[PDB]
Amino acid sequence: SLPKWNQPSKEGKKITNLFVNNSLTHSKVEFIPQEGNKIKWYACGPTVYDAAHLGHARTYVSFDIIRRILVNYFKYDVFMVINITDIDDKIIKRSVEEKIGFTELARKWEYEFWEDMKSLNVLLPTAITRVSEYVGDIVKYIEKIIENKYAYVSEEGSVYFDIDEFKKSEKHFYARMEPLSVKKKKNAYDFALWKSSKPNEPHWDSPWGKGRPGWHIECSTMASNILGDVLDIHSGGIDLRFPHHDNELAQSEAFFDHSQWVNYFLHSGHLHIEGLKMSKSLKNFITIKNMLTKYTSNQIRILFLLNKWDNFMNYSPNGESMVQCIEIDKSFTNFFAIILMKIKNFDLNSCNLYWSDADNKLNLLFRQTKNKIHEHFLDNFNTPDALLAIQKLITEINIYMDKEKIQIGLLLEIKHYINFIFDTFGLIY
């Protein structure tokens, strides 16, 4: 009566002792690749009908940080896919208001989305999967689910997922992550894999008649096509956990007829503003472009670094939440300025390089800081505490650079390490 989860076997895998908050277990569990040091990761992308806002930025920056930690810090081999939802009721409706076709609208806002991602130093994924380019694959995916007896066709030409049949199977559980969130149909909870189109909507041909993919089947199809029958990581905002992500699991399990399509399901917390999710529906949003006319990429990334990725956060506007981010960015800038000049201007001809007690104390604190930050990253990508550890080290390096005769090589190694961590954070100085 309660879903089971299979931790992957550790034999032959890269083992870091990283723990992650897995929505499949509702707990922090050890992260173990399916294969070697490889990580196959699908992340749900945007619905491209309008500009991206600060809440979208929080989710993609947070997962960009996690990806950089996984790749640059831990040296996992990450194969990442992000989709573009360029077929959607929202796109269709917006396109009839603006009197532009659905494709030209979608391409415009996909373009702006990637521009906004680049402006925030978010890395592009390995693969970008647009629904409009995968419709034929979605149809074949739906055919096999029907052939496995987990979907049925209405008289209208729609196709619905058969929840009751899926639950009946001993090897399958419906709504693994939110069990308690559960006319032409068998049961009301059945959701559409193929929607029969009205003759005026955009549509595609299929064995069941002209229609469009249902929302959830788009992501099962695209992720399965590129990454296969086992994903190491699937991610998205917490709102997507049910029904979207639980429905993807059911569809993909039905397609492959196995019991675990995703090993680790990661959900970022929402960015709130004045207590409510930043949302286009609520008219309380700040576009990324507007945000970047007031704050820098570094400052916005520091905002997200200060908040644990899987917890919700509140944004206080009119600069309130950004005061601290600006101060921290200012301290990193001034730290780098001094250390870079001291390295550049150091004169090996005239210096004394005896290793003093002050050099030894700074070095001990340096190595201890590396160990603290390692433990923070292993603790479910705890960037708030890793950022604080860096701040504390900088406070001491600043004292040292002002007062002590300086060990040029120690300062250079410290600079390289802090740069390495800032690269992992996505900060550019």
Ligand X SMILES: Nc1ncnc2c1ncn2[C@@H]1O[C@H](COP(=O)(O)OC(=O)[C@@H](N)CS)[C@@H](O)[C@H]1O
Ligand Y SMILES: Nc1ncnc2c1ncn2[C@@H]1O[C@H](COP(=O)(O)OP(=O)(O)OP(=O)(O)O)[C@@H](O)[C@H]1O
| The entry of ligand X, ligand Y, its own copies, none that residue 125 binds, CB within 5 to 8 Å by partner kind | its own copies
We find the least distance from the C-beta atom of residue 241 to Na ion, in angstroms, to be 6
Q: What is the DSSP letter of 332?
A: H
Largest interatomic CA distance in the chain: 89
Return the number of other C-beta atoms located less than 10 Å from residue 149's C-beta: 13
Separation of alpha carbons 266 and 249, rounded Å:
14
Following CA atoms 230, 232, 237, 241 in sequence, which dihedral angle do they give, to the nearest 10 degrees? 50
Pick 17 or 187: Cβ nearer ligand Y = 17
Residue nearest to ligand Y (CB): 37
The tokens for 242 are 């049910």
What is the x/- site pattern for its own copies, positions 219-258, by CB under 8 A?
------xx--------------------------------
Q: Which of 7, 290, 371, 391 binds ligand Y (CB under 6 A)?
A: 371
We find the least distance from the C-beta atom of residue 148 to ligand X, in angstroms, to be 23
When asked if residue 370 is in the footprint of ligand Y (CB under 6 A), the reply is yes
Closest Cα to residue 63, out of 82, 48, 85?
Answer: 82
Q: Which of 34, 37, 119, 225 binds ligand Y (CB under 6 A)?
A: 37
What is the x/- site pattern for Na ion, positions 156-175, by CB under 5 A?
-----------x--------
Q: Which of 46, 125, 211, 426 binds ligand X (CB under 6 A)?
A: 46
Number of chain positions touching ligand Y (CB under 6 A): 13
Q: What is the DSSP letter of 127?
A: E
Residue whose structure tokens are 């644990």: 308
| The entry of Na ion, ligand X, its own copies, none that residue 250 binds, CB within 5 to 8 Å by partner kind | none
| The entry of ligand Y, Na ion, ligand X, none that residue 271 binds, CB within 5 to 8 Å by partner kind | ligand X
What is the x/- site pattern for ligand X, positions 181-220, by CB under 6 A?
--------------------------------------x-
Sign of the CA dihedral running 251, 252, 258, 262: negative
H-helix segments, 193-321: 215-227, 246-256, 288-292, 297-305
- The sheet with strand 192-196 has its strands ordered as 151-153, 159-161, 192-196, 211-213
For the chain, how big is the Rg over CA atoms in Å? 25
When asked if residue 58 is in the footprint of ligand X (CB under 6 A), the reply is yes
Residue whose structure tokens are 């001990």: 364
We find the least distance from the C-beta atom of residue 225 to ligand Y, in angstroms, to be 24
What is the x/- site pattern for ligand Y, positions 68-87, by CB under 6 A?
-------x-x----------
Query: What's the distance, Cα to Cα, between the start and end of the chain in Å?
Result: 53
Q: What is the DSSP letter of 53?
A: B
Q: Which residues pair with 22 in a beta bridge?
A: 27
Q: Which of 33, 46, 125, 211 binds its own copies (CB under 8 A)?
A: 125
When asked if residue 240 is in the footprint of ligand X (CB under 6 A), the reply is yes
Residue whose structure tokens are 């956060």: 313
Separation of alpha carbons 417 and 110, rounded Å:
36
**Which residues here bind its own copies, judged by CB under 8 A?**
36, 38, 73-75, 77, 79-80, 107-108, 110-111, 114, 123-130, 133-134, 225-226, 348-349, 352-355, 359, 363, 367, 370-371, 407-410, 412-413, 416
Residues that bind ligand Y (CB under 6 A): 12-17, 36-37, 75, 77, 370-371, 374
